[PDB]
Motif scaffolding. Structure first.
Motif, short mmCIF file in Angstrom:
data_model
loop_
_atom_site.label_atom_id
_atom_site.label_comp_id
_atom_site.label_asym_id
_atom_site.label_seq_id
_atom_site.Cartn_x
_atom_site.Cartn_y
_atom_site.Cartn_z
N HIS A 120 1.04 15.16 -5.13
CA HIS A 120 2.41 14.68 -4.98
C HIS A 120 2.89 13.96 -6.22
N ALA A 121 4.14 14.21 -6.57
CA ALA A 121 4.78 13.79 -7.81
C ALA A 121 5.28 12.36 -7.70
N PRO A 122 5.66 11.74 -8.83
CA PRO A 122 6.07 10.33 -8.80
C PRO A 122 7.26 10.04 -7.90
N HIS A 123 8.12 11.01 -7.62
CA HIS A 123 9.30 10.72 -6.81
C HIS A 123 9.01 10.71 -5.32
N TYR A 124 7.75 10.85 -4.91
CA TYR A 124 7.34 10.73 -3.52
C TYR A 124 6.60 9.42 -3.25
N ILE A 125 6.69 8.44 -4.14
CA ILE A 125 5.82 7.27 -4.07
C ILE A 125 6.08 6.44 -2.82
N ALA A 126 7.30 6.44 -2.30
CA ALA A 126 7.64 5.68 -1.10
C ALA A 126 8.00 6.59 0.06
N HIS A 127 7.78 7.90 -0.09
CA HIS A 127 8.14 8.87 0.94
C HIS A 127 6.90 9.49 1.56
N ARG A 128 5.95 9.91 0.73
CA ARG A 128 4.70 10.49 1.21
C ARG A 128 3.49 9.71 0.73
N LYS A 129 3.45 9.32 -0.55
CA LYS A 129 2.39 8.45 -1.03
C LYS A 129 2.73 7.00 -0.72
N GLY A 130 1.77 6.11 -0.98
CA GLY A 130 1.97 4.68 -0.94
C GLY A 130 1.82 4.09 -2.33
N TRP A 131 1.45 2.82 -2.37
CA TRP A 131 1.14 2.14 -3.62
C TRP A 131 -0.35 1.83 -3.66
N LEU A 132 -0.98 2.11 -4.80
CA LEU A 132 -2.40 1.85 -4.94
C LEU A 132 -2.69 0.36 -4.89
N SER A 133 -1.91 -0.44 -5.61
CA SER A 133 -2.08 -1.88 -5.60
C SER A 133 -1.01 -2.53 -4.73
N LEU A 134 -1.41 -3.57 -4.00
CA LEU A 134 -0.51 -4.31 -3.12
C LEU A 134 -0.65 -5.80 -3.41
N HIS A 135 0.47 -6.44 -3.74
CA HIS A 135 0.54 -7.87 -3.95
C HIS A 135 1.99 -8.31 -3.83
N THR A 136 2.20 -9.62 -3.91
CA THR A 136 3.51 -10.21 -3.68
C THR A 136 4.37 -10.31 -4.94
N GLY A 137 3.80 -10.04 -6.11
CA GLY A 137 4.48 -10.30 -7.37
C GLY A 137 5.85 -9.68 -7.52
N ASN A 138 6.00 -8.41 -7.15
CA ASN A 138 7.26 -7.71 -7.38
C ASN A 138 8.32 -8.00 -6.32
N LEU A 139 8.00 -8.80 -5.30
CA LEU A 139 9.00 -9.17 -4.32
C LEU A 139 10.06 -10.06 -4.95
N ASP A 140 11.24 -10.07 -4.34
CA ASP A 140 12.36 -10.87 -4.85
C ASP A 140 12.03 -12.35 -4.70
N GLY A 141 12.04 -13.08 -5.81
CA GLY A 141 11.79 -14.51 -5.83
C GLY A 141 10.38 -14.89 -6.20
#
Lengths: 191, 130, 111, 100, 292, 392
Positions: free
Chosen positions: C1-22
């Motif tokens: 799966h290509a990069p434009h499926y990252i939130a549609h079919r794939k997920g995120w490899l790393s998970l943390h709070t950094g990129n959240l708003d604030g």
RNA sequence: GGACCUGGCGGUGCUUCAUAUCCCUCUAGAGGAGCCUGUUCUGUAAUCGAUAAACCCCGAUCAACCUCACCACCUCUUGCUCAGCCUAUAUACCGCCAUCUAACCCUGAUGAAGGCUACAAAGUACGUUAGGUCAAGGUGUAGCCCAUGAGGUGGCAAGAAAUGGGCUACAUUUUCUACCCCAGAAAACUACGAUAGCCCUUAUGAAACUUAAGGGUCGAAGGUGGAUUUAGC
């Protein structure tokens, strides 16, 4: 070796299998769950080797059975809300002052957040012992901290590094404002 | 375990001090995430725990935030919110409930707990100085 | 799966709070992620069947990896202990690895 | 062991900028007020000038931390566009997705 | 390829996994249903992927794996159906049934079923022309004085496309504390959002945010816009309006108010007048907005 | 401690031990790297500061010839450096503090002139030279030597120095008396009555210098008394009664010593009857050896109710922490499960089999043979396929 | 030599239309001046690349110092790495883009061969290029190696045009004020208009005519610009 999900009875104690938060283990979770966008004339991928199921923050450690068992054991730490305070009408009568402070839970090696030092004190001027002149002087001293619609004086302190120091400073600010509202200088008569 | 069970268990020591306990009029718990399903599961968990501990809880959903930017190739960051308003709970219930739901905070979810403590007037503000 | 499926079919490899708003320290977490991936790919050569999953809860750091059943289990245990200790002392946080072995690369299709 | 000579020069600048910051602030504070006599403000112009040139906070550049690229750097990640796009396209940057 | 033994083992595994899931969620395994399975798997494995098919799924193996043919004859070799040798036993059986129904009668909002789902119902691939023949027979049956059973048979082969475009939703009449009847409605135009209250009896007094409409809308065009709904149904000077609008600009606010008053006035006019207002474009939200 | 992956789950006791040792070796290699190159791990990013995740410094920082550097080397347990610097301070004419030399002599006597990792007390070793050089020898110095010789098996020299201590009109501490008791028992060529009498004389002295015992004195008495078999039973019981009367509570080590002395056997019933329901804390190094020994008795007596009582004691509170290392755990559980298979009804045997294996331990082939024999006795021959699959 | 079969046509013309792009028509603007910003040459001690052609508001979501990899001299040398080279080589490969060039069944007497009619009559199932690019997407190889490497302090010359892009105008559907759409004045030369020039303050900085904002001074050309061009939906 064969997965241990074959050895799990259908009436076991699931909370003991996942006591804490852990990543999805296909050899421990006895579900034929599938995840993946299927290929043409295909089926979603099985759990064994699935990275997508490995990327979900699963709640297998918090099932209703486990939640109830945990909350039954945690009752011993609680204290009871005083019954006299039935609604806000009595809470604002017996405890006029309100102190708002916020904590922030992020993920990282460091816990420090500079926004946690801010403290907000809120008091209704009608709950203070002020006569007419005292109330007028207090309003003119505070300025925009006071809101006429709600009758609430809001002092937000963030000068000090810590939160206890800011809370002490807010209490001190209220005390000095009250005492100087209850004082009449020479220039007062020049109104 | 069917037969091999723990005979007695060491329950933790919870000492009743003599000091007065803090009173929190309200306690707003704003949880932020990139994923709505995780926030819904966390809402279910938190609400069930609140019900089981006797706390009064009401839930609502603040509007989402979307930060778009371009390097053309345009990237995006969604931040979804869930607000849990607890009300009329003391200091010890607040501590235990918050420890529980913070320890069980799923990865990728940040929390902001606003606590509205109730306090009395200082004795220095009861009457004016003479 | 290509990069434009990252939130549609794939997920995120790393998970943390950094990129959240604030939130803060997004760059620090990103650099940590890059070093973790390079370190793991060099410490488990030819073992990792798929990408790492870097999870962050509070102070913890879980590296959930998918490896092969080619290397012997003793070497896997030795490397897990070594990596846990070394990364814990390098980032001053309690790191933890969650190896999952598969017989071979889990092929999805043939691009 | 930095990326290149240019990054090393900027690491050198950021070091001295940190060491001299307090002294620069104080001497700079004397010259930014219309209270102290002009005799004193004129000298602080000499004191601030004599301080080593790399200590000036205006000579620091926001190079990428992985490629030392001078421009195209998003400050929130300290990463140039090429390195960011590589990580964002692989789903290795938590929360980042392509817009639709 | 999926052999039948594989599917059997999958069925057994799904049953055991269902009992495990019911154990995990505290529910009774006996009455545990597929909706319950879906809810439990959504809770235990939260996934906000936009694609509903990329999310975790715990379905029956019958549903998830594809299907196969059916046996058309037993061990003796005799086909079960009397129209077997046509090769289209289902389709020709259906045509035979329809023809018999037509013979019986001769003695005495929705859409036609589309070709692919007809094939699904018959479990037989069929061409375009034979589909048309079947549809012509169905139409011929409909024209005749079809009875109840015949109407049910025809209903078997007709899905829904909805007839509600005919009918706009009428608001309910409410009563204020004075005992005056009124109706409330909402409308939106660009970023402007309006909520109108229309009273059954009035003298044409329109109040926008507590201000008279001619003072709120100096431009004649906006007053034309507010006039349009009442003027269309010849009820100018016969209602009082109390509206609150927010956001947008002058024309967006005028349009949002106009839509809200039209929707509220739908309550006090005849159904024919509701349809007339619908055909005049007075009850349709305008979706035209700024493009990115 | 292991990983739930099927390929990494240990399948045998040997495999489990091998995997644990491999993991610990990896941790040790990482620790070696961290301490060898602190400069790569000094950068702290954790708030609050975590001291346990910082490099450890094992090198002296003071380089001059001074008493403070000597104290530093004693704190770091660097024996050879400390001896060399004490010599250098003597050469530099610098007078050493009594407390500092006592700390040095503590280190030397504990470590026996060797660096950290038995060592037999070597004549004229550094401890003896430092001890003889001392201008003033106080009670602590004599106590520390005597204890040191006793630890490294210089029993006769320990007794001689105790007599010398007595000649110097100094006193001995409780631990010193424990060491003397051990030394008297380890002295060769003496009969039971002579050694017992001398132990009594040591206790009379410990009365004379106003020294009160502790648990360890009685524990050492019982441990040493174990060596003399049937002659020791009544004296050991008498010692237990004394310890109870004085107000010193027994520990698991005391009961372990008594049980292993009597087993060479109905005292176990009373010992259990007294221990039922009680919670214990670590008071002696030998405490962890109780349950194993207790279980051994239950196997030899073939008394299953006693086995259940012992296991129930183990399950009460945090008692399980006293099961000891993996070898002891496996011994305890193997004897326990063998007894269940031998004496209990087959269905309860199967329940214990599923509850204990593999979660508690990995079985030995003898346990499988015992389980098969139990199934044969109970005539439940439908189960051999599952048992063989499990053994595979 | 007789009869027949498949054709292809590597070929044409005409007819009707479906006939969307491309046309044509149609609508609404800009194009001629003054600036700036790239780029061209020229000039200069003075960045680079873009190597046939088609993609400069290009790398740059930003150049006083730094950035900077350009020039003058001065100054250091096994040197942040143990070196280092924005030095060359994709005219070494690799990534990239680009230029060009079946099975079965029936019929014909079992011949080449043929197989449809729905109110149904046999059909069912790449190569190429002295190409670009090392902002490396890569791997190697050649050179310099008390300097093709470092560092310091100053300087990149500018007037002839040729273009592209933008801005701002040439006004009355306009300008100022109130107000935010029911008002009052101004008005073609003291009318409009300059993001034109010059001078003075403010911000940032160590350093500001040299960057930006405002004020003053000034009130230039400009007088609507054909062939063209920009969009339409």
């Amino acid at each position: 070796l064969p997965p241990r999900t074959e050895k799990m009875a259908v009436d076991q104690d699931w909370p003991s299998v996942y006591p804490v938060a852990a990543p999805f283990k296909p050899s421990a979770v006895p579900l034929p769950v599938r995840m993946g966008y299927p290929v043409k004339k295909g089926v979603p991928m099985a759990k064994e080797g699935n990275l997508e199921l490995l990327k979900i923050p699963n709640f297998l450690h918090l099932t209703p059975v486990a939640i109830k068992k945990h909350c039954e054991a945690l009752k011993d730490f609680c204290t009871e809300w005083p019954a006299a305070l039935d609604s806000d009408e009595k809470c604002e009568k017996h405890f006029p002052i309100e102190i708002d402070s916020t904590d922030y839970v992020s993920s990282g090696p460091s816990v420090r957040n500079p926004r946690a030092r801010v403290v907000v004190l809120r008091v209704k001027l009608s709950s203070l012992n002020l006569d007419d002149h005292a109330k007028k002087k207090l309003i003119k001293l505070v300025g925009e901290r006071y809101c006429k619609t709600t009758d609430v004086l809001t002092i937000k302190t963030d000068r000090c590094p810590l939160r206890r120091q800011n809370y002490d400073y807010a209490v001190y600010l209220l005390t000095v404002l009250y005492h100087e509202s209850w004082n009449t200088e020479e220039w007062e008569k020049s109104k | 375990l069917h037969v091999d069970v723990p005979k007695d268990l060491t329950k933790p020591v919870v000492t009743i001090s003599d000091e007065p306990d803090i009173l929190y009029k309200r306690l707003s718990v704003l949880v932020k995430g990139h994923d709505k399903a995780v926030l819904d599961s966390y809402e279910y968990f938190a609400v069930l725990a609140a019900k089981e501990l006797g706390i009064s809880i009401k839930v609502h959903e603040p509007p989402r935030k979307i930060e778009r930017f371009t390097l053309r190739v345009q990237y995006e960051m969604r931040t979804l919110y869930r607000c849990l308003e607890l009300e009329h709970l003391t200091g010890s219930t607040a501590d235990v409930y918050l420890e529980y739901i913070q320890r069980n905070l799923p990865e990728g979810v940040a929390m902001e707990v606003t606590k509205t403590q109730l306090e009395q007037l200082p004795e220095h503000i009861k009457e004016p100085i003479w | 799966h290509a990069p434009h499926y990252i939130a549609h079919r794939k997920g995120w490899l790393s998970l943390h709070t950094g990129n959240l708003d604030g939130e803060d320290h997004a760059a620090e977490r990103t650099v940590e992620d890059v070093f973790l991936r390079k370190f793991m790919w060099g410490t488990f050569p030819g073992c990792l069947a798929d990408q790492l999953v870097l999870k962050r809860r509070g102070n913890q750091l879980e590296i959930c990896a998918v490896v092969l059943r080619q290397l012997s289990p003793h070497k896997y245990y030795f490397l897990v202990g070594y990596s846990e200790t070394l990364l814990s002392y390098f980032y001053k946080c309690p790191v933890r690895l969650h190896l999952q072995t598969v017989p071979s690369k889990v092929v999805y299709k043939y691009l | 062991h930095y990326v290149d000579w240019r990054m090393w020069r900027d690491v050198k600048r950021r070091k001295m900028a940190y060491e001299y910051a307090d002294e620069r602030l104080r001497i700079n504070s004397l010259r930014k007020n219309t209270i102290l006599p002009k005799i004193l403000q004129d000298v602080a112009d000499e004191e601030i000038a004599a301080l080593p040139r790399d200590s000036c906070p205006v000579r620091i550049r926001n190079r990428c931390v992985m490629t030392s690229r001078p421009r195209g750097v998003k400050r929130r990640w300290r990463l140039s566009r090429i390195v960011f796009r590589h990580l964002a396209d692989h789903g290795q940057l938590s929360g980042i997705q392509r817009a639709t | 390829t999926y052999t039948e033994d594989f599917i059997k083992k999958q069925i057994e595994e799904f049953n055991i996994g269902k009992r495990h899931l019911a154990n995990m969620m505290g529910e009774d395994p006996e009455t545990f249903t597929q909706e319950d399975i879906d809810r439990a798997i959504a809770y235990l494995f939260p996934s906000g992927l936009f694609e509903k098919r990329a999310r975790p799924v715990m379905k029956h193996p019958e549903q998830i794996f594809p299907r196969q043919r059916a046996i058309q004859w037993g061990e003796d070799g005799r086909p079960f159906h009397y129209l077997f040798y046509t090769g289209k036993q289902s389709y020709y059986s259906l045509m035979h049934d329809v023809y018999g129904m037509l013979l019986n009668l001769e003695k005495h909002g929705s859409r036609w079923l589309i070709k692919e789902e007809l094939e699904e119902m018959l479990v037989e691939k069929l061409s375009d022309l034979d589909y048309m023949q079947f549809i012509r027979l169905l139409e011929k049956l409909l024209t005749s004085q079809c009875g109840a059973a015949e109407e049910e048979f025809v209903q078997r082969f007709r899905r829904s496309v909805t007839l509600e475009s005919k009918k706009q939703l009428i608001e309910p009449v409410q009563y204020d504390e004075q005992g005056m009847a009124f109706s409330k409605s909402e409308g939106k135009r660009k970023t402007a959002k309006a909520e109108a209250i229309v009273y059954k009896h009035g003298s044409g007094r329109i109040k926008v945010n507590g201000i008279d409409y001619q003072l709120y809308f100096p431009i004649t065009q906006d007053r034309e816009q507010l006039m349009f709904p009442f003027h269309f149904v010849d009820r100018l000077g016969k209602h009082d309006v109390t509206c609150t609008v927010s956001g947008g600009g002058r024309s967006a606010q005028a349009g949002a108010i106009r839509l809200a008053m039209a929707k509220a006035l739908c309550s006090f006019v005849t159904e024919d007048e509701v349809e007339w207002m619908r055909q005049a474009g007075l009850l349709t939200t305008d979706p035209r907005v700024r493009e990115r | 401690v292991f990983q739930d992956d099927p390929y990494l789950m240990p399948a045998s006791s040997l495999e489990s031990r091998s995997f644990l040792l491999a993991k610990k070796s990896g941790e040790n290699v990482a620790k070696f790297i961290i301490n060898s190159y602190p400069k790569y791990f000094q950068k702290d990013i954790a708030e609050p500061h975590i001291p346990c995740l910082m490099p450890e410094y094992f090198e002296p920082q003071i380089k001059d010839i001074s008493e403070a550097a000597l104290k530093e080397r004693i704190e770091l347990r660097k024996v050879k450096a400390s001896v060399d610097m004490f010599d250098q301070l003597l050469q530099a004419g610098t007078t050493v503090s009594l407390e500092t030399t006592n700390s040095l002599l503590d280190l030397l006597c504990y470590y026996g002139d060797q660096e950290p990792s038995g060592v037999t007390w070597r004549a004229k070793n550094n401890a003896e030279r430092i001890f003889s050089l001392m201008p003033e020898k106080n009670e602590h110095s004599y106590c520390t030597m005597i204890r040191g010789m006793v630890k490294h098996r210089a029993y006769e020299q320990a007794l001689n120095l105790y007599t010398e201590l007595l000649n110097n009109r100094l006193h001995a501490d409780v631990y010193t008396f424990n060491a003397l008791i051990e030394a008297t028992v380890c002295a060769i060529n003496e009969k039971f009555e002579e050694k017992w009498s001398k132990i009594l004389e040591l206790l009379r002295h410990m009365v004379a210098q106003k020294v009160k015992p502790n648990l360890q004195t009685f524990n050492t008495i019982l441990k040493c008394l174990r060596r003399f078999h049937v002659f020791a039973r009544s004296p050991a019981l008498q010692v237990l009664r004394e310890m109870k009367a004085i107000g010193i509570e027994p520990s698991l080590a005391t009961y372990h010593h008594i049980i292993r002395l009597f087993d060479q056997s109905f005292i176990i019933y009373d010992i259990m009857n007294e221990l039922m329901g009680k919670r214990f804390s670590p008071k002696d190094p030998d405490d962890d050896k109780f349950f194993q020994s207790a279980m051994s008795i239950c196997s030899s007596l073939r008394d299953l109710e006693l086995a259940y009582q012992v296991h129930g004691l183990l399950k009460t509170g945090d008692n399980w922490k006293f099961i000891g290392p993996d070898q002891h755990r496996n011994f305890y559980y193997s004897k326990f499960f063998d007894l269940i298979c031998l004496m209990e009804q087959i269905d309860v045997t199967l329940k214990w089999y599923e509850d204990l294996i593999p979660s508690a331990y990995f079985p030995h082939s003898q346990t499988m043979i015992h389980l098969l024999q139990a199934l044969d006795v109970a005539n439940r021959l439908e189960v051999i396929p599952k048992i063989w699959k499990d053994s595979k």
